[PDB]
């Protein structure tokens, strides 16, 4: 029995079946905590379940058909299945918190996307949204292992640890060595000879991150900020590794809006990029152009992180959750529409062993296994 | 206003 809690906004009622639009401490989900999940993942408004029967179950704003249940314009209040998947076996819904498309990768390694089509996102060679899920036709002959998506470009990487990147080519988040949008899955040859075990994507003018199996984290795509890690603020569109994280032992890397945020083996959290409204936890809001710990986290060891739009959540090994970042809509989980611009304990948990968090744009997720 | 924040629409 899988136990869900929510919070944040629910004005499109993306938090599945909740009164209010201002959520402001977790919330136990009756809907969410029936399905067994073993994955919640938030977009923008917009929330996926994906069950250990390997069904998906999506609710909020049904805009550009990000929730892939067959329509384009008003809300889905109560989570339904993505009955275009119910013959497989899905094991990852991949969504950026800023995103209006997402992929499902099936455990036998078969990738499908949906939603918004824009600057080709999708993968099947065109620009067009697809409503439901349709099979990615080029990745095909290949085994994925992993999936991430960012608001405009999406990625995936295989078994054998190459990474496949396409969509909106701008700024250089693709990485091939040019700005030119892919309406196909590319392979990004640069990191050929590295086994890319993790892929993370950012949204708006983004960038992309990927962790190696030596532990080696790669950025590219826009530098406003310093969300690449390197300082300052210029763009590449070529994977370049940031020096400051080797050796750090990183497992985990996501990208919120406009920021980066990789967590540690031993359990450490570091932020970089844009600094506003609080969301790098460093307890400032000015931007930090290089990756920094965490401090107040410092002794906590985190075993799961997730990112939003302008908020963060972090669990400790004993099962407590620290949220950081804004709250106009109550996003932190601290009873308040006051921003978190410290790691602080979420309310409402105690009791509750949660094992995994996940944000959407302006909403949050805890559950327990 | 930052481009990434949400407006609650109820």
Redesign the interface.
């Known amino acids: 029995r899988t136990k869900v809690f929510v919070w944040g906004?629910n004005?499109?009622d993306q938090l599945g079946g909740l009164k209010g639009?201002?959520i402001k401490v977790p919330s136990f989900s009756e809907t969410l905590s029936a399905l067994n999940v073993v994955q919640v993942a938030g977009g923008?408004?917009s929330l996926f379940a994906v069950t250990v029967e390997g069904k998906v179950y999506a609710c909020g704003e049904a805009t550009n058909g990000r929730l892939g249940l067959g329509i384009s314009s008003g809300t889905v209040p109560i989570p339904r299945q993505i009955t275009a998947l119910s013959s497989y076996v899905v094991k990852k819904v991949a969504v950026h918190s800023?995103g209006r498309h997402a992929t499902a990768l099936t455990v036998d390694g078969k990738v499908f996307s949906w939603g918004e089509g824009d600057d080709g996102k999708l993968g099947h060679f065109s620009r067009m949204n697809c409503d439901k899920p349709r099979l990615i036709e080029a990745l095909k002959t290949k085994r994925i292992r992993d999936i991430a998506c960012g608001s405009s470009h999406s990625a995936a990487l295989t078994s054998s640890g190459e990474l496949y990147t396409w969509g909106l080519g701008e700024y250089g988040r693709l990485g091939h060595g040019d700005n030119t949008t892919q309406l196909k899955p590319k392979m990004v040859k640069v990191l050929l000879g590295h086994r890319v075990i993790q892929v993370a994507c950012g949204?708006?003018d983004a960038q992309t991150l990927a962790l190696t199996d030596e532990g080696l984290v790669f950025s590219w795509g826009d530098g406003d900020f310093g969300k690449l890690g390197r300082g300052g603020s210029e763009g590449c569109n070529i994977p370049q590794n940031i020096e400051r994280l080797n050796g750090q032992g990183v497992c985990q890397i996501e990208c919120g809006?406009?920021f980066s945020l990789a967590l540690t083996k031993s359990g450490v959290v570091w932020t970089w990029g844009k600094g506003?409204?609080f969301r790098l936890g460093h307890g400032s809001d000015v931007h930090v152009r290089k990756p920094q710990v965490v401090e107040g986290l410092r002794g906590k060891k985190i075993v799961h992180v997730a990112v939003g739009?302008?908020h963060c959540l972090a669990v400790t090994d004993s099962g407590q959750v620290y949220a950081w970042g804004?709250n106009?809509?109550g996003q932190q989980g601290n009873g308040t529409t006051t921003v978190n611009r410290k790691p602080t304990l979420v309310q409402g948990l105690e009791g509750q062993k949660i094992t995994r968090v996940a944000c959407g744009?302006?909403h949050s997720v805890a559950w327990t296994t | 206003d930052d481009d990434d924040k949400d407006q609650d629409e109820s």
């Open positions: 906004l004005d499109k639009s201002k923008s408004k800023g949204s708006r809006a406009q506003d409204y739009a302008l804004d106009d809509h744009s302006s």
